[PDB]
Amino acid sequence: AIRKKLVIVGDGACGKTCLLIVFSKDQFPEVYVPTVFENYVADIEVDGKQVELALWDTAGQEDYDRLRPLSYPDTDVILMCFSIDSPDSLENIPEKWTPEVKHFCPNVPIILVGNKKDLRNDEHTRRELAKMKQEPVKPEEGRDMANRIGAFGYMECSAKTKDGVREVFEMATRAALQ
Amino acid sequence: SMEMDEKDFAADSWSLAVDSSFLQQHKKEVMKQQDVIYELIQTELHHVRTLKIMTRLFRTGMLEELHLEPGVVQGLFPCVDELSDIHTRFLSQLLERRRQALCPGSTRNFVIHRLGDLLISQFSGPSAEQMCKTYSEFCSRHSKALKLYKELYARDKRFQQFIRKVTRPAVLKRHGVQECILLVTQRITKYPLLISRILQHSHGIEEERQDLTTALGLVKELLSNVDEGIYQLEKGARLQEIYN
Numbered sequence: 451a452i453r454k455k456l457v458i459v460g461d462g463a464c465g466k467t468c469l470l471i472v473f474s475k476d477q478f479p480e481v482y483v484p485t486v487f488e489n490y491v492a493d494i495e496v497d498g499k500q501v502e503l504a505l506w507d508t509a510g511q512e513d514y515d516r517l518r519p520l521s522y523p524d525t526d527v528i529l530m531c532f533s534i535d536s537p538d539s540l541e542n543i544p545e546k547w548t549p550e551v552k553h554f555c556p557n558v559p560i561i562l563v564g565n566k567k568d569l570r571n572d573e574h575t576r577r578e579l580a581k582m583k584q585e586p587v588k589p590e591e592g593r594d595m596a597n598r599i600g601a602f603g604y605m606e607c608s609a610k611t612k613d614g615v616r617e618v619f620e621m622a623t624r625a626a627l628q
Numbered sequence: 629s630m631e632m633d634e635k636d637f638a639a640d641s642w643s644l645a646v647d648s649s650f651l652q653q654h655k656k657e658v659m660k661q662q663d664v665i666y667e668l669i670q671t672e673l674h675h676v677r678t679l680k681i682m683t684r685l686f687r688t689g690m691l692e693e694l695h696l697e698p699g700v701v702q703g704l705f706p707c708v709d710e711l712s713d714i715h716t717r718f719l720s721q722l723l724e725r726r727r728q729a730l731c732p733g734s735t736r737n738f739v740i741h742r743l744g745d746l747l748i749s750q751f752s753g754p755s756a757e758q759m760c761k762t763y764s765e766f767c768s769r770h771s772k773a774l775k776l777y778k779e780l781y782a783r784d785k786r787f788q789q790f791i792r793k794v795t796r797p798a799v800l801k802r803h804g805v806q807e808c809i810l811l812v813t814q815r816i817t818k819y820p821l822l823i824s825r826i827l828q829h830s831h832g833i834e835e836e837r838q839d840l841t842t843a844l845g846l847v848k849e850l851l852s853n854v855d856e857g858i859y860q861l862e863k864g865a866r867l868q869e870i871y872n
């Protein structure tokens with residue numbers, strides 16, 4: 451078993467902490483969803499290979515430009531998150547996060563992950579967004595951004611329903627291994 | 629950590645830690661506030677536990693078993709004694725506030741109504757100066773500590789055997805030397821997230837809402853000062869590189 455390091459980056463309301471919690475616990479918390487995520491070491495077996503994957507978050511570090519890069523040393527895979535109910539979080543990806551991740555983690559694979567895909571069919575979400583001349587992020591818009599920034603891949607998941615969560619981390623393990 | 633404290637914080641939430649008959653007696657909004665307060669203390673207990681692994685297991689273990697060059701162990705774990713003293717004192721006050729709140733005849737049923745006052749004391753005056761001073765020093769030595777760790781693990785056989793031996797137990801799975809250093813650095817930025825969510829459920833008493841609003845502002849002022857005092861130190865960094 452080899453040791454690989456994954457770091458999840460993205461805006462405050464992109465749902466990155468919820469994604470790490472639902473994966474580390476291996477279910478959606480029924481009694482209390484924690485505010486913070488410390489760290490976790492996942493035992494994953496992808497395509498026959500056994501890997502120890504350390505999971506880290508950048509939550510709380512968004513306004514601290516000299517504290518945040520201390521999370522980057524020795525990263526093997528970057529998860530770049532955005533929320534499908536927030537087209538403004540997708541706009542920050544190419545001009546805010548991508549230049550930073552490429553300077554501190556050159557040559558590291560980046561997977562662009564669209565979170566909260568369940569909200570693409572939420573009526574309250576569509577009503578709130580229409581009041582600001584907006585609509586939930588379309589699948590082709592996510593793929594176009596992942597292409598534009600040179601991502602290893604584009605994936606979608608719902609931390610609330612657990613759909614696509616196992617697959618994002620199995621794929622991240624594969625990217626960390628290449 | 630000590631067994632008394634581990635059992636008091638073994639549950640996933642305050643609603644699961646207290647007796648179900650005690651829980652039923654409280655309003656939903658109190659339960660929600662108490663769950664976040666329980667998380668603040670539980671993660672502070674874990675943070676203090678990380679600092680004890682760095683001082684007792686790694687640092688002292690290296691000093692009493694290896695023949696490393698003088699000053700090498702200091703470079704691997706900078707400010708760990710000062711950090712452990714700051715956080716063990718803060719945890720001591722958090723645990724004493726919980727213990728005063730326990731019902732008579734009970735070691736698990738409690739409600740913490742006042743917390744802002746304690747957070748204002750921690751994040752103000754000389755205690756805030758010592759946290760600011762210690763974290764600016766720690767976070768500027770973070771990169772140099774990791775590089776030194778990587779050099780020693782790659783070149784010294786006795787260091788490699790020591791690391792493999794003391795980190796072999798399952799309870800140390802996510803607590804290697806590099807994990808402890810990032811766990812410590814990331815800790816300070818978790819406080820505003822925890823305090824803002826406690827504040828979200830503390831509007832019932834106006835004095836409490838105001839004390840937490842002040843404490844939130846104090847933590848953000850401290851984080852801004854720590855962030856401005858950071859400059860990564862490099863092993864063998866020339867003067868020309870530093871002043872340019």
Ligand SMILES: CNC(=O)[C@H]1CCCc2sc(C)nc21
Pocket residue numbers: 467468483484485486821822824825
């Ligand atoms: C601290 N900020 C938040 O939004 C809280 C309040 C709602 C519940 C959750 S889940 C999470 C990671 N944070 C929060």
